[PDB]
Amino acid sequence: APANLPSIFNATSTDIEQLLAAQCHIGSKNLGVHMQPYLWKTRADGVNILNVGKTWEKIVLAARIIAAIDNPADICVISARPYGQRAVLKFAAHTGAQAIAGRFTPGSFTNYITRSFKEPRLIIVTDPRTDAQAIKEASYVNIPVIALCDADSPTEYVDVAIPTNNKGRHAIGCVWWMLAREVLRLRGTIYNRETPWDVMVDLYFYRDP
Amino acid sequence: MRAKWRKKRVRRLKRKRRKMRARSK
Amino acid sequence: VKKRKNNGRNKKGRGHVKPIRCSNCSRCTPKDKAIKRFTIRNMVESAAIRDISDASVFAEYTVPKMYLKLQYCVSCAIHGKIVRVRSREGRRNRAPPPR
Amino acid sequence: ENDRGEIVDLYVPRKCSATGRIIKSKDHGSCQITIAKVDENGRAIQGENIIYALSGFVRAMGESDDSLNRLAQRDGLLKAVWNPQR
Amino acid sequence: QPVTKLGRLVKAGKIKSMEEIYLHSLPIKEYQIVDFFLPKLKDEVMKIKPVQKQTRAGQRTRFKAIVIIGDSEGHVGLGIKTSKEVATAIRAAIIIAKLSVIPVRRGYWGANLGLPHSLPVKESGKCGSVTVRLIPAPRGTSLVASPAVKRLLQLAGIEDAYTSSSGSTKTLENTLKATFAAVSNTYGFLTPNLWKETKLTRSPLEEFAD
Amino acid sequence: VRTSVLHDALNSINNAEKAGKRQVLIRPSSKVIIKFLQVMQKHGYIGEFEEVDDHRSGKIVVQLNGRMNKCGVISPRYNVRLAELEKWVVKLLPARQFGYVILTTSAGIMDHEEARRKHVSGKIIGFFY
Amino acid sequence: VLAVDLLNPSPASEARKHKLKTLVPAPRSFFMDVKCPGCFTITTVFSHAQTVVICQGCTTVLCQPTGGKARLTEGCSFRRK
Amino acid sequence: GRVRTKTVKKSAKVIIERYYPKLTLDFETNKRICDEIAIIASKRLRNKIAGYTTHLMKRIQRGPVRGISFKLQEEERERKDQYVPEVSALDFTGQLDVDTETKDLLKHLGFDSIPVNVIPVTQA
Amino acid sequence: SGGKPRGLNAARKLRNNRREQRWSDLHYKKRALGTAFKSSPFGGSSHAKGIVLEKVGVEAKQPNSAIRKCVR
RNA sequence: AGGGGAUCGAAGACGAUCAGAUACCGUCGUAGUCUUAACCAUAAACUAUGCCGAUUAGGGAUCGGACGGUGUUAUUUUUUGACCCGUUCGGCACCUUACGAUAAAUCAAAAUGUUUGGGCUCCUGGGGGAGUAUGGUCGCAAGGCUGAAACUUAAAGAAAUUG
RNA sequence: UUUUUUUUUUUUUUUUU
Ligand SMILES: [Mg+2]
Ligand SMILES: [Mg+2]
Ligand SMILES: [Mg+2]
Ligand SMILES: [Mg+2]
Ligand SMILES: [Mg+2]
Ligand SMILES: [Mg+2]
Ligand SMILES: [Mg+2]
Ligand SMILES: [Mg+2]
Ligand SMILES: [Mg+2]
Ligand SMILES: [Mg+2]
Ligand SMILES: [Mg+2]
Ligand SMILES: [Mg+2]
Ligand SMILES: [Mg+2]
Ligand SMILES: [Mg+2]
Ligand SMILES: [Mg+2]
Ligand SMILES: [Mg+2]
């Protein structure tokens, strides 16, 4: 903590409020061996309560990795289910990433003549179980993977795990909100750490057509 | 030929062999 | 080649299981290996249910249901189309067909 | 090294930061996680960063996340995540 | 001409040596890269093996070619391609062979003068049932391998080695793949000389933004 | 029935090493095991090993640094002459400058290279490289 | 996990594991004092007593053995030593 | 049966994806459209393309079809995406109704200042 | 592999087991039993002399159609 | 060798089918099927997977015991049973995966093996001839156990692939 | 869910930039 982590990055009550309101502390009923460190407590009904403190702390580290690339076009974000689709396009809009929503075409990373050849440098996925095709293709071209892992979510190649609820619309948007703000602060487009951001939270929440 | 009844055919042939030897003995 | 992990039955740890007789063959087959169907259908066909209700006297009578347990061998179940040949990958699916 | 003290190897492979196993040339799936340092104002410093190399073996097993957490605190990038007693 | 990010960097001079690529696990997808960094290579054809598919109107005959590419400096590549024609299969096998070129570690037997003459350790590769084992040999002992394996070891630059083989060595495709695995694994068996900290550096791909 | 506690220790060590684990629990405790561990530690192929005391055969927790290829025992403990070390080393080790064959001599548990210096021999019990 | 400090496990884990499989086999049993009703004598009873313990002179049964754990006679108070 | 081939369907979609304002629901007018914009030189093919084009245009008047933009949708989905209510659903405006274990996390994390309303946890 | 004994004082078992199992080797069994001296038409010699009794023809095995010329 | 003998049913007799039908199909039907006393010792006697021991990926069911907690239910001078959640020991198994293995099918063992050594026992060496001949031994017999050779042959065989 | 036996010997493919 004292080294390479100033006290500014510590959590704020506002961040805790939004994460709790999004129910990011409500995890899946099934606990994985690799998601054990992120477990706080298990309720009487069997629903696992996560540790929001680690969730925010992991988000800062994830933003640090994103800012280290110094090329927005080399960052790729994927979401299959429509709940995370809306957040992913908005995240690409403000950050500068390349987004894929819905079906991920196989051979995007390995096959170089397909229409969706990417050559990215960082794979950010939501619910790394329905995006297993994206993860597996990353196992061929040496791309670190950041995933919004849940308690039962497989962590086959998840290099950086963000323990959060990844099934509700509110939880996904808030976590994608946290990362979007943090990345922009790190890169420098936002002058102050304490200043509020003009964009709000419901812009990332999934909406029906 | 089935091995079950190849075994039976040989086993029957062995019984006849023993009778031929008892006849000589 | 071993076609099935459970061979063709369910007796792992049971040693020996008393056999039974096929419903339409009288074949002597083990109880766990046999293919068993529990059938619950009305004792009168749906077409003739109305006429039975007409003859009800005594008009609140509910027609009883026949309670049959049919046991088949592999040859009879396949020939009777109770079960069908499945693919190599589809053989492992131990789930009853949905309704 | 030879008797003259000269390196004759074509190159020297790297070692995984979690298990220490040499990462082979054709060991695809072995990622190189790069984390940039920050100043007192939270601005990422360009050209100065922490570099981690992970073999494909540790990634495939699914322990890459926990190993990264241990490595980050060993270099001080995290406050309280990795618990030895757990 | 280049189509991938590495291809652009190679012709742009952003990569100086081939082993610079080898340090990072960067896949090579364009065979013009290998020709650029490794000229004077020598291609040798082992065998043309006819493989046939049974059809309702006869047998569909395809030819499989096995080609090894290497220079005596310590790089070898093995490529197998099946095609309708021998000429096309040979050409495509060469392209695949150049793509899968790997560095070869060379060690020594006891001494430390004129050291790069033999294998550094004992390595064995197993493809299918064939197991080929390579053993470091004292200087002055020539290659003691079978002609198929001996030719491949010659292209690797190895001069002294003891070789053994189990399994069905008559499968020439399997033996070469088994030998290739052993040569691949001799450079990643951890040794005392490699038991030293290394300063990690960013890959050229993630530091150049062209 | 336990027959070679030395094999149990080295098998447990090698299993954890291949799995990438940085530590391993060893049961039980023996004089041979501790001396065999110390031979590892002198050449640096392992790190700290700690012995837990108990009113029975003890336990050992060995911290692994990851620079350990293969450790194994030899059964039986063949009687080795001085001329037989080179054949034993050649047929059992990698290139003859990294690994170390472990013997038990009248001088104690010690290396094959150390035997050439002290001009002694004994029974082979294990190896590492 | 690849990194565990096996020397000092959690006390919750110690109460979770088997009595032999812990780092040091500490017995899970205890000795306990039974207060019988109607008298003021203290008798030490094993937690896992296999015999019907009767107090010294009170001629009253204090526990019945069953299922590897003594069941104290109703109307008696106990205090673990 | 009368099932149109891909050479008709793919070409018609490109016509709609480009020339939607010029097109309409009348086959006779759509017949003349294909004359100016496309090079068919085949009356049967051109009639089929115009006929299939008219079919989708009538479909467009209902909300379908997926995958045939039709840039007028593209500008529309832009304004759908930009839409956002001013009052956040995450606002506490009884402020935060969580359970005993959630509030315990707040004490552990050092944030025991949120207006937390502790609710019981029981199993039915 | 096999469950061969691995004691330091099991040479007797190892030699006895090898002696038993070596009989299954066809070439050792032929030499050890001395079948060439017993049952072979020759007395184990490379050549032998004889008197021609008659000339016989042998039909060739499939696929081959010819009369191989031989003598008894 | 006695008792019993309902049903079914080798052998056998008929009636069909068929070119024939000493079979499948149908009607009879003896030994047997059942039991006491004494033999026999073989099965695709199969998990085709020897016994002991250590380690190694996750998960949920289930059986027996034990422990901790919780709330209903029956009894109760508030114990016990049923149900619920969790931990652990010992079982029958199962689901996904491959850091591994195998030729492959597949395997948490068939893993920890050319980087080859934890302990012990048994069996195999291309296909036939042949589990045959002979000798021995056990059995009332049927047979069991042990067990060749001459001669003959370029394949036999295993797992998958396309037709 | 009536039955449907048999098909004379041999013969059925090769190389490289
Ligand atoms: Mg049985
Ligand atoms: Mg062989
Ligand atoms: Mg011994
Ligand atoms: Mg021939
Ligand atoms: Mg038998
Ligand atoms: Mg058997
Ligand atoms: Mg075991
Ligand atoms: Mg259980
Ligand atoms: Mg229980
Ligand atoms: Mg059981
Ligand atoms: Mg042989
Ligand atoms: Mg044989
Ligand atoms: Mg076959
Ligand atoms: Mg025929
Ligand atoms: Mg005929
Ligand atoms: Mg015939």
Swiss-Prot record, chain C:
One of the GO biological process terms: translation
A GO cellular component annotation in the UniProt record: cytosolic small ribosomal subunit
Q: Which keywords are on file for this protein?
A: Cytoplasm, Ribonucleoprotein, Ribosomal protein
* Compartments, as annotated in UniProt: Cytoplasm
Q: Where is this region: Disordered?
A: 1-19
Q: Does the keyword Ribonucleoprotein apply?
A: yes
| A GO term for molecular function | mRNA binding
Say which family it is in. Answer: Belongs to the eukaryotic ribosomal protein eS26 family.
Task of the protein: Component of the ribosome, a large ribonucleoprotein complex responsible for the synthesis of proteins in the cell. The small ribosomal subunit (SSU) binds messenger RNAs (mRNAs) and translates the encoded message by selecting cognate aminoacyl-transfer RNA (tRNA) molecules. The large subunit (LSU) contains the ribosomal catalytic site termed the peptidyl transferase center (PTC), which catalyzes the formation of peptide bonds, thereby polymerizing the amino acids delivered by tRNAs into a polypeptide chain.
Complex formation: Component of the small ribosomal subunit (SSU). Mature N.crassa ribosomes consist of a small (40S) and a large (60S) subunit. The 40S small subunit contains 1 molecule of ribosomal RNA (18S rRNA) and at least 32 different proteins. The large 60S subunit contains 3 rRNA molecules (26S, 5.8S and 5S rRNA) and at least 42 different proteins.
Q: Would you tell me the protein name for this molecule?
A: Small ribosomal subunit protein eS26
Per the record, the gene is rps-26
Q: Which residues of the full protein are shown?
A: 2 to 100 of 119
Swiss-Prot record, chain D:
Principal location: cytoplasm
Q: Which GO BP terms, alphabetically?
A: endonucleolytic cleavage in ITS1 to separate SSU-rRNA from 5.8S rRNA and LSU-rRNA from tricistronic rRNA transcript (SSU-rRNA, 5.8S rRNA, LSU-rRNA); endonucleolytic cleavage to generate mature 3'-end of SSU-rRNA from (SSU-rRNA, 5.8S rRNA, LSU-rRNA); translation
Which Pfam family name is an example for this entry? Ribosomal_S21e
Gene Ontology CC terms: cytosolic small ribosomal subunit
User: Does the keyword section mention Iron?
Assistant: no
Q: Which domain of life is it from?
A: Eukaryota
Q: Which Gene3D superfamilies match?
A: 3.30.1230.20
The terms under GO molecular function for this entry are:
structural constituent of ribosome
Alphabetized, the UniProt keywords read: Cytoplasm, Ribonucleoprotein, Ribosomal protein, rRNA processing
Q: Where in the cell is it found?
A: Cytoplasm
Q: Which PROSITE patterns match?
A: RIBOSOMAL_S21E (PS00996)
Similarity field: Belongs to the eukaryotic ribosomal protein eS21 family.
User: Subunit composition?
Assistant: Component of the small ribosomal subunit (SSU). Mature N.crassa ribosomes consist of a small (40S) and a large (60S) subunit. The 40S small subunit contains 1 molecule of ribosomal RNA (18S rRNA) and at least 32 different proteins. The large 60S subunit contains 3 rRNA molecules (26S, 5.8S and 5S rRNA) and at least 42 different proteins.
Q: What is this protein called?
A: Small ribosomal subunit protein eS21
Protein's gene: crp-7
Swiss-Prot record, chain G:
Main subcellular location of this protein, as a coarse class: cytoplasm
Q: Which domain of life is it from?
A: Eukaryota
Keyword tRNA processing annotated: no
Q: Where in the cell is it found?
A: Cytoplasm
Q: Which Gene3D superfamilies match?
A: Zn-binding ribosomal proteins (2.20.25.100)
Single GO biological process annotation from the record:
translation
ZnF (C4-type) residues: 36-58
Q: What does the note under cofactor report? A: Binds 1 zinc ion per subunit.
Q: Which InterPro entries match?
A: Ribosomal_eS27, Ribosomal_eS27_Zn-bd_dom_sf, Ribosomal_zn-bd
- List the keywords (alphabetical): Cytoplasm, Metal-binding, Ribonucleoprotein, Ribosomal protein, Zinc, Zinc-finger
Q: Which PANTHER family match?
A: 40S RIBOSOMAL PROTEIN S27
Question: What does the record give as the function of this protein?
Answer: Component of the ribosome, a large ribonucleoprotein complex responsible for the synthesis of proteins in the cell. The small ribosomal subunit (SSU) binds messenger RNAs (mRNAs) and translates the encoded message by selecting cognate aminoacyl-transfer RNA (tRNA) molecules. The large subunit (LSU) contains the ribosomal catalytic site termed the peptidyl transferase center (PTC), which catalyzes the formation of peptide bonds, thereby polymerizing the amino acids delivered by tRNAs into a polypeptide chain.
Q: How does it assemble?
A: Component of the small ribosomal subunit (SSU). Mature N.crassa ribosomes consist of a small (40S) and a large (60S) subunit. The 40S small subunit contains 1 molecule of ribosomal RNA (18S rRNA) and at least 32 different proteins. The large 60S subunit contains 3 rRNA molecules (26S, 5.8S and 5S rRNA) and at least 42 different proteins.
Protein name, UniProt field: Small ribosomal subunit protein eS27
Curated annotation (Swiss-Prot), chain H:
Annotated Gene Ontology cellular component terms? cytosol; ribonucleoprotein complex; ribosome
Q: Which GO terms describe its molecular function?
A: structural constituent of ribosome
Which GO biological process entries does UniProt record here?
translation
Principal place of residence: cytoplasm
| Entry keyword ATP-binding | no
In terms of Pfam families, this protein maps to: Ribosomal_S17e
Q: Which UniProt keywords apply?
A: Cytoplasm, Ribonucleoprotein, Ribosomal protein
Cysteines joined through disulfide linkages: none
Per UniProt, subcellular location reads as: Cytoplasm
Recorded family membership: Belongs to the eukaryotic ribosomal protein eS17 family.
- Entry-linked HAMAP family: Ribosomal_eS17
Q: What does this protein do?
A: Component of the ribosome, a large ribonucleoprotein complex responsible for the synthesis of proteins in the cell. The small ribosomal subunit (SSU) binds messenger RNAs (mRNAs) and translates the encoded message by selecting cognate aminoacyl-transfer RNA (tRNA) molecules. The large subunit (LSU) contains the ribosomal catalytic site termed the peptidyl transferase center (PTC), which catalyzes the formation of peptide bonds, thereby polymerizing the amino acids delivered by tRNAs into a polypeptide chain.
Q: How does it assemble?
A: Component of the small ribosomal subunit (SSU). Mature N.crassa ribosomes consist of a small (40S) and a large (60S) subunit. The 40S small subunit contains 1 molecule of ribosomal RNA (18S rRNA) and at least 32 different proteins. The large 60S subunit contains 3 rRNA molecules (26S, 5.8S and 5S rRNA) and at least 42 different proteins.
**Name this polypeptide is given:** Small ribosomal subunit protein eS17
Source species of the chain = Neurospora crassa (strain ATCC 24698 / 74-OR23-1A / CBS 708.71 / DSM 1257 / FGSC 987)
Q: Which gene encodes it?
A: rps-17
